[PDB]
From a paper:
Hence, the focus shifted toward D247S, the wildtype Asp bears one of two major carboxyl groups important in primary amine coordination upon ligand binding and recognition in PotF. We introduced the S247D exchange into PotF/D and into our high-affinity constructs E39D–Y87S–F88Y and E39D–F88A/L. PotF/D–S247D showed an improved SPD affinity in the regime of the first-round salt bridge construct (KD(SPD) ≈ 9.4 μM; Table 2). Nonetheless, all constructs regained PUT affinity in the medium to low micromolar range. This was expected as we reintroduced the wildtype-like proximal primary amine–binding site in these variants. All structures but PotF/D–S247D adopt a fully closed wildtype conformation. All in all, we determined salt bridges and the key carboxyl-harboring proximal residue D247 as the basic prerequisites for a complete closure of PotF constructs. Fixing each component by itself was not sufficient. Only the combination of both allows full closure, deeming it an intricately regulated process.
To gain insight into the evolution and designability of ligand binding and specificity, we analyzed the homologous PBPs, PotF and PotD, which are Escherichia coli putrescine (PUT)-binding protein and spermidine (SPD)-binding protein, respectively. They constitute the first elements of two separate multicomponent uptake systems (PotFGHI and PotABCD) to transport the cationic polyamines PUT and SPD across the cellular membrane. Still, the protein-binding modes differ: PotF shows affinity for PUT and SPD, whereas PotD exclusively binds SPD. Prior to this work, we grafted the seven differences in amino acids from PotD binding pocket onto PotF; this resulted in PotF_SPD, which will be referred to as PotF/D throughout this work to keep naming for mutants more concise.
Author numbering: 28 to 369
Write the structure that this text describes.
Amino acid sequence: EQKTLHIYNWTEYIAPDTVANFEKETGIKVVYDVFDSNEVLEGKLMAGSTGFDLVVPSAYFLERQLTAGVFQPLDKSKLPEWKNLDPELLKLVAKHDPDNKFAMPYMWATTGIGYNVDKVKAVLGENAPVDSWDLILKPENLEKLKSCGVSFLDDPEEVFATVLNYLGKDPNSTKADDYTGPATDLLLKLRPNIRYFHSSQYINDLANGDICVAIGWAGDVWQASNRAKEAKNGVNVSFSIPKEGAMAWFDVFAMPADAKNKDEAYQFLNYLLRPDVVAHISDHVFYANANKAATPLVSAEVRENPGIYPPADVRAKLFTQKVQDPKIDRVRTRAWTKVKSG
Ligand SMILES: [Cl-]
C-alpha cells in the first residue's frame, strides 16, 4: 500500500517545501526529477516509457502532440478546484489544447529584455529606451552596449518571431523569405555586438554584473534580480516586456499516456489548485501562476510586478507561437546557423 508519484519539471520551478508539504499531507512518496533543457524533456516524452506520472511541457509542444498519443486527457472530476484557474488564461492555452483537455496550466511568462539598470543608463542615458526592443535591436544601441555584454537566447524559434514582430511582420510568418531575408539581415547587423547565444548563462551573468542586456525568460530574470539583491552586490537587474509586444508562453502539467500512479497524480494536481500552494510557488520562483483564486495570496512584490503579472494592455500585445510547416522549421535552423556564424 505504498503510494508513489513521479514528476518531471524544470529546475528552479517549485517552492523548496512544496513536495515536503504534499508528502506530509498525503503520505505519498514523491520522486521529483528536474530538467534544464526542453530538448531533453521532449526527446524522452517522444520515446515513451518515461516512468513519469506528471510532466511539465510547453503548451506549444502539447499542441504538436495532440494526435500522437503522448498524453492522456485529464479527468476533471478528480480536480474539484479546477474552477480556480483563470478562464481568460485557459482560453489562450486552449489555442494549443482545445477545451483544455490535456493540460493544467501551471505558470506562464514572456520572452523579453533582462538588463542591468545602472549599466544601461551609464551607456545610453537615463532615458534609455528600456520599454522597447529598440534597446537591443537597434544596431546603434547595441554597438554602444557591446562592451558591457549582450546575450541572446540560442533559440531561433523565439528570436526569429521576436525580430519578425519588431519588423512589423507576422511573428508567426509562414513565408520563408521573411526569415532568410529581412530577419537575417537585421540579425547579421546586430551579430558583431552579441557576446554569446545561450539558453541560460545570461541568468547568472545578469546577477553578477557580467552582462548588461539579454533576451530572456521573465521569471528567470526576476530570479537573477532577486539573487543579486540577496548577495548585496549592488547589481540592479530589471526586466521589460517591450511596448512592441513579445512572445508569451505557458508551462503546463500533463499526464503521459502510460502513467501508472494516476490517483496520486490527480491528488498532486488538485493540491496545486489550492490557492495558497501555487501562490507560495509564485512567491519563490517569480512567475505568474494560472490560478486566479491564488492571485490575492501572492506576495505584493510579485503580483504587483507588471513584468510578472502584466495588465490587459500588455497582454493584448503578446503573441504565441504557431506550429509551422517542417519546411519553415528547416529554414529557421539553417538561417540560425548563418546568423551565429556572422
Ligand atoms: Cl507554450
